[PDB]
Symmetry: D2
Subunit: 292 residues, 4 copies
């Protein structure tokens, strides 16, 4: 729902760069079988950047259909113009998605006041639960804990994807928000740490190819079995890192193809095909995880 | 014109956030009279982020119409999806613009190879001159001199707006490109330095309100009269800094409103109104520049 | 010993800038009464930088005497020349100190191999237990986990003071070292987090003025009572931050004087007296902690 | 001489790590013949870090003796304790050195006010010219232009070695100081740029092995012949970079040994011998410079 291992799912494409429905179906069955808690549809790893809003919606709706109620679906709804964020969100109103993942505006570098006004207006135009998303390395913008606390007072703003990799944020935010506000890691390599500090789960790239291990790792973590969870983490750590050897989702799409989870590893420009060195790097990491 | 003082022009809005033609006319007249070399239309300072492509196109066409041939117009054409950059570029084919200013894809953090393919594909599908645009603080990625060198070999790719503020970039780029490739500062505070090291001009925010001083400073710099230019630069430096006291273009729109150049300082969310503290800072900088 | 709240104790000085024995005695009695686990003598907060090695040794020996076996004493032994680090360490051989805190060489920015050779030679010239100390913001040098793992294989290298504030180091180092290798925070503001991740204690500036709260906080943490510990942490957090409002130990020495723990707040150049604004800032933080 | 090419000279050692007089003589003769403007003795590249003050003094006196009046000598006199900087400075009173190069206190991270008091006290207690030295990557602190301006009003404080590599500093400083205050690069890779913006010379590592080319480059720069200088700079750029492939002065000592300028490339710990990979990198850079 908004806890445990949530997959930031690739948008599998055919060689023309359009969504491949057979491959998407395969992935969703895989996550259902693997115990993945929920799917984020057309977020960062889903190539929101290169899909238009029509194409984006189509993929979300298709993911919802294919999930067929077996697994919750969260739509990516980020936009750097507030009007566009509202319009995108409105597409999914009364759709069946259980919530939205909405990133700080990118490029235009708003103030903390701008962020507040952005997310508040968005939340006001929907009944859907909103998960905030902070990823300064991609946006040029850093949603600080104090502002998270402001926004957590809005009824349908109910969690955050914290992708800074700065573990001090977990308790800075937690102390400012209510106990049911959800704290999700957006950084695979630090996600178990994030959970040990009081985080509730992760929105994961790694889970695309190691869904069963990730679900188990998060379950152990939630049970306070951190040492057991670390064993899994150590097995996956090469993948947490090397899935970013080239820009995400170049590595993870290749990985999915190699594992036979998708038909092709095709991306849209300006993402380009994985290099030979990248292939070998990712293959090694998959081997280390025992997936190959 | 791709040398000298080039204004990164505001998109003046009425209170509803729609383009104010009368204000835009006033600004264009001001720049024609003040010796500005060219206008960048719907660039960063022009709120490209919050105008849709159709609104974007309208503002460029209006700017051309109002310019009435008296000052060259460069269109902002950046997009983080290569297909979308190409598509936007096509709207301006035979429009009368003299070239395009195209930013590195934002948010998705492409590799240098991806940047190369991005910009190459765009240049391929137009006859218009292309000015590359590097601004890592906004985008999350950094177009490096090596790649600029590769791209400069494309007939159509004629220069760069270098907005890092990292002055070593000037001669790293210059040595990799031909003598006609144009090097333009995208950082007002370091732009005179940038010119002194070999740069050809500036795509300027400060020029929105200090057009004549900017024009003279850039001509003096082009003539090698750096001490003379620097005296002007010193009176402008508070403005170069404090126009970013709050996110651009909030301070510069307020300044234009205060001088009577535009009718309102309205922006679109996630930009919010200037704070009182911001007004005082900006006002003092206007006064140091001799503008109030 | 090497667990719980370890104070990075100020070197209290008279108005001439020499160690004040009465004030030192008062502090040591205070830490004995407060339940502080151990004292680091002439570390960072002890002004190792401005004491010569004779003066440094004198303070260590005086601290040892005054402690009179009631509380363990760790000597600061850092030097950026390996020969000097050995010579300093040798002063304390068979002294009564229970171990040494030895920082990465500062200024000369050694390789990971240089760090390895530095700490290994030092450890080879003593039977004293060695605590490594990483504080890149002061040294220009970052001792990475992998190198920590190398050095942990040396018999008398038994722990690390990790002052990066980067919480990911806790588990990166822990997985590479044996279960009795000690992990101590060197960053008050993140120290409870550091302990929640598996750290064993903190070498603390805050403990100079809030020794009882710090000892209790670390005890709760060690017992797994993290929520109770956080309550104390929140009470101290203003102090964790504001004790660095001006360069350490300017704030904490003023604080000690204000609390009547020391006779004067005198420092050696280039440390200078606390500013009026700094006073008011620290006073507020002490009030928030309920110490004033 | 405080303009032109100033060499940051190595302290050549025998295998025991003691100063090699015969090697030092050879280096000084080389610099006299090659047109170097002056020698910095026991600066950063001279292993000030690992020589004690008495060894430090000996090397300066030997350098003066060997120079025999044929080239000016500046002594490195930095210390992180103000009393110790003054004390070291006194050793060189009436020695024959032409001035001192004094770094911002390292490790203890003083305030700007502390820097001001530090440098003011030092200048006060000598008649020797003082050159301030800013290198935040080594020290943990940053002497800002405002404070440089304050200090430049001291009769005795005559210039700065600016080693940030941040080229905006040149004119920020220049506008705050008199026209006779000397601005010297401390970053070989950006030194020609630094000179082109108004700098007067460079305190150079590269000059240890490319003395004549460095001398000519700096004279051309001083005459405003930047294109001519830049051609030399381009052949030297691999060296400007790869002399820092491993910590300075490891690469430059190896290079001096390879050219036969010094008898051994021995250093003192925590500096360690060059790696094989480092040798190959440095050798290629020597060959690109035409030196092998
Ligand atoms: Cl996502
Ligand atoms: Cl622009
Ligand atoms: Cl300490
Ligand atoms: Cl030097
Ligand atoms: K809420
Ligand atoms: K071209
Ligand atoms: K050990
Ligand atoms: K002076």
């Amino acid at each position: 729902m908004f806890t445990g291992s949530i997959v930031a799912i690739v948008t599998p494409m055919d060689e023309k760069g359009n969504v491949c429905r057979a491959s998407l179906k395969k992935l969703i069955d895989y996550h259902v079988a693997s115990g993945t808690s929920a799917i984020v549809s057309v977020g960062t790893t889903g190539e929101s950047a290169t899909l238009n809003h029509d194409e984006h919606a189509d993929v979300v709706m298709m993911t919802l259909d294919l999930a067929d109620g077996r697994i919750p679906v969260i739509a990516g709804t980020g936009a750097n113009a507030t009007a566009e964020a509202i319009s995108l969100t409105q597409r999914f109103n009364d759709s069946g998605i259980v919530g939205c993942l909405t990133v700080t505006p990118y490029y235009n570098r708003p103030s903390q006041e701008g962020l507040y006004q952005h997310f508040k207006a968005i939340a006001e135009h929907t009944d859907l639960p909103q998960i905030l998303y902070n990823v300064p390395s991609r946006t040029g913008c850093d949603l600080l804990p104090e502002t998270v606390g402001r926004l957590a007072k809005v009824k349908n703003i109910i969690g955050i994807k914290e992708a800074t990799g700065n573990l001090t944020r977990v308790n800075q935010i937690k102390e400012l928000v209510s106990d049911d506000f959800v704290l999700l890691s957006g950084d695979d390599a630090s996600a178990l740490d994030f959970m040990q500090l009081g985080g509730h789960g992760v929105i994961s790239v790694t889970a695309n190819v190691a869904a069963r291990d990730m679900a188990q790792m998060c379950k152990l973590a939630a049970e306070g079995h951190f040492a057991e969870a670390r064993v899994i983490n150590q097995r996956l750590m090469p993948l947490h890192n090397k899935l970013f050897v080239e820009p995400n989702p170049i590595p993870v799409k290749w990985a999915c193809k190699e594992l036979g989870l998708v038909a092709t590893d095709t991306l849209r420009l300006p993402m380009t095909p994985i290099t030979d060195s990248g292939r070998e790097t990712v293959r090694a990491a998959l081997k280390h995880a025992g997936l190959l």
